[PDB]
Amino acid sequence: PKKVLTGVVVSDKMQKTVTVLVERQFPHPLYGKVIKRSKKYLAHDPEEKYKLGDVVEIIESRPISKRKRFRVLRLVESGRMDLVEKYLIRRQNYQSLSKRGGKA
Amino acid sequence: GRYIGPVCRLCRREGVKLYLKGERCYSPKCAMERRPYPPGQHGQKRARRPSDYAVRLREKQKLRRIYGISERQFRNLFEEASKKKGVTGSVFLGLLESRLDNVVYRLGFAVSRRQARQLVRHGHITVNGRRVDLPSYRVRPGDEIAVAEKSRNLELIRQNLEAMKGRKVGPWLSLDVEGMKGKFLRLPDREDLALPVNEQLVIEFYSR
Amino acid sequence: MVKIRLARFGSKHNPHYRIVVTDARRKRDGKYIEKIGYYDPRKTTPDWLKVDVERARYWLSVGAQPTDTARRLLRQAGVFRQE
Amino acid sequence: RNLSALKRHRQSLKRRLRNKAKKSAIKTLSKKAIQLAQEGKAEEALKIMRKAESLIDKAAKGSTLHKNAAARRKSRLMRKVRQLLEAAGAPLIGGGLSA
RNA sequence: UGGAGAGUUUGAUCCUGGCUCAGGGUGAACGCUGGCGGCGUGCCUAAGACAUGCAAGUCGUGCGGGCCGCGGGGUUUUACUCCGUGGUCAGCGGCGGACGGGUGAGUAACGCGUGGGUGACCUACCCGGAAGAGGGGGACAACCCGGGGAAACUCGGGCUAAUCCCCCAUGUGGACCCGCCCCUUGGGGUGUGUCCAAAGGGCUUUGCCCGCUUCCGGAUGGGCCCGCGUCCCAUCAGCUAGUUGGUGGGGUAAUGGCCCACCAAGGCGACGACGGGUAGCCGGUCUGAGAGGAUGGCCGGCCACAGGGGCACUGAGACACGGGCCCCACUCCUACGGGAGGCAGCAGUUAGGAAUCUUCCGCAAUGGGCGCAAGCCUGACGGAGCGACGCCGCUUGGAGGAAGAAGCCCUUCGGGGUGUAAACUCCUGAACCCGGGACGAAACCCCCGACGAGGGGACUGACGGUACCGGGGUAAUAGCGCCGGCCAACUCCGUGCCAGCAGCCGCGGUAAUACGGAGGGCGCGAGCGUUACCCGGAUUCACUGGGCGUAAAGGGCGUGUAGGCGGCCUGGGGCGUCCCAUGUGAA
Ligand SMILES: [Mg+2]
Ligand SMILES: [Mg+2]
Ligand SMILES: [Mg+2]
Ligand SMILES: [Mg+2]
Ligand SMILES: [Mg+2]
Ligand SMILES: [Mg+2]
Ligand SMILES: [Mg+2]
Ligand SMILES: [Mg+2]
Ligand SMILES: [Mg+2]
Ligand SMILES: [Mg+2]
Ligand SMILES: [Mg+2]
Ligand SMILES: [Mg+2]
Ligand SMILES: [Mg+2]
Ligand SMILES: [Mg+2]
Ligand SMILES: [Mg+2]
Ligand SMILES: [Mg+2]
Ligand SMILES: [Mg+2]
Ligand SMILES: [Mg+2]
Ligand SMILES: [Mg+2]
Ligand SMILES: [Mg+2]
Ligand SMILES: [Mg+2]
Ligand SMILES: [Mg+2]
Ligand SMILES: [Mg+2]
Ligand SMILES: [Mg+2]
Ligand SMILES: [Mg+2]
Ligand SMILES: [Mg+2]
Ligand SMILES: [Mg+2]
Ligand SMILES: [Mg+2]
Ligand SMILES: [Mg+2]
Ligand SMILES: [Mg+2]
Ligand SMILES: [Mg+2]
Ligand SMILES: [Mg+2]
Ligand SMILES: [Mg+2]
Ligand SMILES: [Mg+2]
Ligand SMILES: [Mg+2]
Ligand SMILES: [Mg+2]
Ligand SMILES: [Mg+2]
Ligand SMILES: [Mg+2]
Ligand SMILES: [Mg+2]
Ligand SMILES: [Mg+2]
Ligand SMILES: [Mg+2]
Ligand SMILES: [Mg+2]
Ligand SMILES: [Mg+2]
Ligand SMILES: [Mg+2]
Ligand SMILES: [Mg+2]
Ligand SMILES: [Mg+2]
DSSP states (O other): OOOEEEEEEEEOOSSSEEEEEEEEEEEOTTTOOEEEEEEEEEEEOSSOOSOTTOEEEEEEOSOOSSSOOEEEEEEEEOOOHHHHHHHHHHHHGGGSSSSSOOOO | OOOOSOSTTHHHHSOSOOOOSTTTTTTTOSSTTTOOSOSSTTSSSOOOOOOHHHHHHHHHHHHHHHHTOOHHHHHHHHHHHHSSSSOHHHHHHHHHTTBHHHHHHHTTSSSOSHHHHHHHHTTOEEETTEEOOOTTOBOOTTOBEEEOSTTOSOHHHHHHHHTTTTOOOOTTBOOOGGGTOOBBOOOOOSTTOOOSOOHHHHHHHHTO | OEEEEEEEOSBTTBOOEEEEEEETTSOTTSOOSEEEEEEOTTOOSTTSEEEOHHHHHHHHHTTOEEOHHHHHHHHHTTSSOOO | OOOTTSHHHHHHHHHHHHHHHHHHHHHHHHHHHHHHHTTTOTHHHHHHHHHHHHHHHHHHHSSSSOHHHHHHHHHHHHHHHHHHHTTTTOOTTOOSSOO
C-alpha cells in the first residue's frame, strides 16, 4: 500500500506545489512519555486547488522532483489559520536565539 | 590432574571420613584414626570462627574430592544443573553419580573409585556391548554395564568381585555377580545417597 | 540461473550436505533460496537421505538445473516416476 | 604477462566503431527529417523520416540500442515531425504516419 | 527459574561520597612451565612496499589457415598438382572473464536495518506456450610482401572463411505516431499508416541432436522511490544558487533538479539545519536479575574500495582487482626519444609492532566457467603443516627413611612435622612394536528400453596405511600463584624507614605470619600468573532505580514566547491505547 499521511498546508508559495506539515504521535523508547514530532512534505498540486491552511491527505507517489514525492489525495477540512500560526510563530522565535538579540 | 598425590592427607584437611583409599580404609587406616587433625605442622591448634565463605569452600571441596575430578570439569556440571529443570541442588548429584567411573565404584567392581578410574581408562569395561575408556561417559538408565569379555579373568577382578558376592547395592542399580554385569536402573535421589555434604552450601558457593 | 545443488554443512572429516535451490552465481554455502532435503554420504542413520519430492517437481517445473551428482539423489528418492 | 583475454579488448574496439557509426547515422539522419518538417517539405520529410525509423529498428536488432531506447527515439521523432507539419502543411504525402 | 557484597575519611558514630577488590569475557600479548590427541582459531600496527611461483578460461560439433610429419591419387617417369589423417601454434568467432577469492580505506549516507511502492523499470544462461528461417552481397585478421622502433611494439600494401557484418523477402507477432474503447499516473485492448525477424553445425544423414529468430508468460537476479530506526560536540545557529518549484528538451531500461535553456522566488533549521569529531551497517557477540551497557572478530547477508585522482568503451550486466584511456606518486628497463608494472588472490619476503602461520598435498568429494560429449580450467574448495591461541576429552597407577665444611624444618640442637607420602609388595600397561584396514563413491559414461527405465560386477580416495580393530608390552612428565584484612592458607632464620613489597587499606625504625630465604599450608593443574580492554558489582546518569535547608546541587527577582501539562456533564469521531485474525521476522 502506498502510504497515506494527513496534514496541514502551511505554504502555497510555490508553482504547482504545497508544503504539508504532518504530525506523528508516538511513545518514547526509554522514557515512555508520548511525544509529538512532525515533518513537512512537499506535495504535488496540479490545478493549484488546495490553498493555505487546508487539511489534506497526501499519498506516496512516483517522483515529481527532488524531495517532491507526494500527491495531494483529497481535501478533508477547509481553512484554519490557527494551525498555520502555530507553525508560523515557531519560526518567528528563531529571530532571537542567534549571536544576540538584534532589533529584529 | 585428578589430584594424584597423598590421598589421606586431604581425608582430614576436609574433616569427615573419606573413602578414596578403597578398602585400604576399613582396616583402621584411612588416616582417620591416630591423627584426625589436619595435615601440616599446625594440625593441633584451635582454629577460629571460619568465614561463611570458608565453610562453603570447605564443603564444596569435600564434594569435589570425594568424586576426585578436575575443578574445570566439576564446575561444568554445576552450570548444566542450574540450567536444567528441577532442583539444581540434587540434579547435580544425579550427574556425579551418573559418571561411569563412579558407577563402577558403586557396582563394587573396584574397591576404590580413584583406583577405578584407571580401571576404565584401560578399557576393562563395556556398556551395552562396546568398550568405553572414558570416566566422563554419562550412563543413562537401562544401560547394562559389564566387565570386558577378553579381559574378564584377571587379578584384582577375581578378588574384588568375589568379595562382592553376598552384598547388595543402591536401589538404583541391579547387579549380576556370577556374570559380572547389571543395568543402571535409575537416577538416584538425595535420600538414596549417604554423602556427608550439604550441597545447598555448594550451590551457595558458586552462586556467589 | 537457478539451480539445485548440495551445500556443505558438516565439519572436518564429517560431510553433511544440504540440498538447496539457489542462484548459481551465489557462493556454495551462502543465502540459498529454499532447502528441500538433506544428504549424508556416510549413511550413519536409517534416514541418510530425505527430500521434499513435491517441492522438487515445482522448482523443476520452472527450470532449476540440478548438479549431476544431486540429480542422482532425486532419481534415487523417486523424484521422477521413471518406470 | 600476456593474458590472451586481451583478445577481448581488441574485439571490443571492432565493435565500438560499428555502433558508433551505426547511430551516428541516426543522429544526422533524424536531424534531417525534422529539418524538412520545419519547412513543411512533407514528401521529402517523410521519405526521409521513413528510412530513419527503419535505420533505428535495425540498430536495435543487434546490440547498439535494443529496448525502449529505439522505441522512444522513434517516438520522439514522429511526435516532433508531426507537430511541425501540422504548423500549416497537411501530411499530403502520407508516408509513415497514421491518418 | 531470577537480584550476596567487602575494604577505605573517625579517638569512636551515623550519613554523604569517590577509590579499590571479589565475577564473567578475549583474534590477545609477556613471565615461569610445558605430555597427548580431536575440533576451532591465528597482522588488532603499515588500505606500507613487494622477489619468485601458481591463481580464468574454454569450445575443431562456429571458420580459414601456418609449421613439422605420414599415406592414397592424376603422368610411361620426373617436375607440377589433387585427396585423406596425425601432432603443434596463434588468428577469426561464441560463451565466460561483472561469479567466485581479498580488504575496511572511504561513507552519518535511502549506506545499512525493518516495512512497503514500481500505471517508473531491466534480467544472459534456465522453464512453459505460439509461430518462422527464402534469396542475394560485404569486410577484417590469420596468412603474404614491405617500412619504422634499442625496446614495448608500431606503420603501409595484398588475399580469404564463418554461427562475424550488411540489403532485399516472409509479419504468427512485435515497436511508433494518431484515433472512437476499457482501465485509471506510462495498465490492458483495437483500427488505418510506417518500421523490424533469422545460422548454421553434428552424426548410426532427407529425420534425429545442439543451436538460430520474433513474441507471451514463469522463475531467478537486480535498478529506482517512500515510512520509520541508526554515534558524540551548541565552546558548530543560522544554512542554500541547481539552491526550491515550474513549462520544455536532453539522457536513462526507468522516475527525478540527474543534466541543459528559459520563467517564478523559493527550500532548510532548536523536533538541532549548516560545520566539526569518530565509524562500514546488520544477523549476531560479551555482560547484566532485568531494563540496560559494550561491541560488529570467525561464520552469513548487504555496502564500499582494488597504489591516489578522473573517465568512457564493450556488454544482458562493469565504471570492470589479475580490462582500456589520462593525470599524479613511487619502483624498474632505457641505445635518453621512450617503454614497463599494482599480492586488500594462495603461499612467501621485508618494514612497522608487545604480537599473528607452510613459498606444503589434491581434482577423490562439493561448488563454478566452457564443451554434444570426451574433457579442460578452478591457491573457490576438500585435507595436511606450524602456534597450550581457545574449547573439550586424556596420561604422569603409587602399600616402606632421613649423614648442613654458604638451601630436611619446628624454643640458642629443640618439641613435633612432611605422611602412607617411594629409588624398588603386588596389579593393570600411556609410549612403543608387529598384522588387518576403511567409510567418505556414485553419478557424469557405455550397454537393454522412448541415446533420463533399477543393466552402470567399466573407472574413480588428496586425507592415508590415517582413523578404527586385534595380538605384544615398559610404573611411565608437574608445574604456577598464593598464605596481614577484604581472601581459602603460619611457623623459623636473615634484614632494621635499609634492601624491598604494594590491586585498595598499608608493612619495614632489632624481637616483621606483609620484605628475602626455609619448612609447612591453601588454590589451581598442562597449565598457572602479570598487563591491556569490555560489561559487572555501580540504585555511581537512577526508565525500572538517585538526588538539590547545612553533604555537590534552586536560576539574584520578575514578565512572558515556544513547548509540557489541564475542573465537572452529554454526544459524534477512533490518532494514541486495547483485542482478534493474518503476512513478515532467511540460514
Ligand atoms: Mg576467445
Ligand atoms: Mg573528615
Ligand atoms: Mg584511624
Ligand atoms: Mg570503621
Ligand atoms: Mg589491518
Ligand atoms: Mg591443423
Ligand atoms: Mg584454437
Ligand atoms: Mg559529518
Ligand atoms: Mg529504507
Ligand atoms: Mg589490409
Ligand atoms: Mg548474426
Ligand atoms: Mg525486412
Ligand atoms: Mg574507517
Ligand atoms: Mg597496497
Ligand atoms: Mg581508481
Ligand atoms: Mg555477455
Ligand atoms: Mg551498450
Ligand atoms: Mg568499481
Ligand atoms: Mg576484471
Ligand atoms: Mg592481483
Ligand atoms: Mg598474500
Ligand atoms: Mg622489528
Ligand atoms: Mg592456515
Ligand atoms: Mg565439478
Ligand atoms: Mg582451505
Ligand atoms: Mg560405497
Ligand atoms: Mg569425473
Ligand atoms: Mg543407474
Ligand atoms: Mg584467613
Ligand atoms: Mg609477594
Ligand atoms: Mg625477626
Ligand atoms: Mg613471610
Ligand atoms: Mg602478602
Ligand atoms: Mg585440558
Ligand atoms: Mg548502571
Ligand atoms: Mg545495573
Ligand atoms: Mg528516576
Ligand atoms: Mg546521590
Ligand atoms: Mg560548605
Ligand atoms: Mg551546598
Ligand atoms: Mg531564591
Ligand atoms: Mg494541550
Ligand atoms: Mg482532561
Ligand atoms: Mg485506533
Ligand atoms: Mg506478528
Ligand atoms: Mg533465525
